[PDB]
Amino acid sequence: MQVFIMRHGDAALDAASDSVRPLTTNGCDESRLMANWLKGQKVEIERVLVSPFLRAEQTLEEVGDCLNLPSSAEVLPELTPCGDVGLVSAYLQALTNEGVASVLVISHLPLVGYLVAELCPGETPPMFTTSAIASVTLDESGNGTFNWQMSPCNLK
Ligand SMILES: [Ca+2]
């Protein structure tokens, strides 16, 4: 199963509280830039898992405008910045055995980094710039292979 792990776009420095911070215009542009690139890679997303924080959901919104995504997304409380990487991993292993072909995960740091290390033995947590995406190939046993990582600064 193909797992695309994405960090949300650039978010506003100020809001009433962290969970409701919106994406900046730059955050919107960089997310669409990445979405357009995934479209050129001939990528087809079957399932989408997203954090409940507004910045992750708005990133999903911007991505869905350039890339074909399923009708509904799964909002996981475990995808917040301090979510349990073990539960997210178990969730992904469940879908792999279910037969799901690909998944797009939009989350935050540091979780996004820990998730790669958790899924791919021998890999230390990679750094993620906003809107950056890492591709991982996962099998029924929960073992993954870290394929590559692409970021906005690279596409530019
Ligand atoms: Ca469009």
SSE layout and pairings?
Elements: E1 2-7, H1 25-40, E2 47-50, H2 54-64, E3 74-75, H3 85-98, E4 102-107, H4 111-119, E5 133-138, E6 144-150, H5 152-155
Parallel strand pairs: 1-4, 2-3, 2-4
Antiparallel strand pairs: 1-5, 5-6
Helix pairs in contact: 1-2, 3-4
The structure holds calcium ion.
Calcium ion binds next to loops.
Description of the molecule:
It is an enzyme of class 3 (hydrolase). Pfam families: His_Phos_1. Keywords: Hydrolase, Protein phosphatase. GO terms for molecular function: protein histidine phosphatase activity. The longest helix has 16 residues, at 25-40. A six-stranded mixed beta sheet has the order 3-2-4-1-5-6, sandwiched between helices. Helix 1 packs across helix 2. Helix content is 35%, strand content 20%. It is α/β, with parallel strands linked by helices and 156 residues long. It has one domain: 3-Layer(aba) Sandwich (Rossmann fold).
Shape: globular
The CATH superfamily title:
Phosphoglycerate mutase-like
Rg estimate, integer Å: 14 Å
From the 3D coordinates, which CATH architecture would you assign? Answer: 3-Layer(aba) Sandwich
What is the tally of helical segments?
5
Bound molecules: calcium ion
By secondary-structure content and strand pairing, the structural class works out as: alpha/beta
> What is the makeup of the main sheet?
6 strands, mixed
Major beta sheet, strand line-up:
3-2-4-1-5-6
Report the sheet-strand fraction.
15-25%
CATH class: Alpha Beta
What is the percent of helical residues?
Answer: 25-40%
PDB class: hydrolase
Keywords: alpha-beta fold, hydrolase
Assembly: monomeric
Entry title: Structure of the protein histidine phosphatase SixA
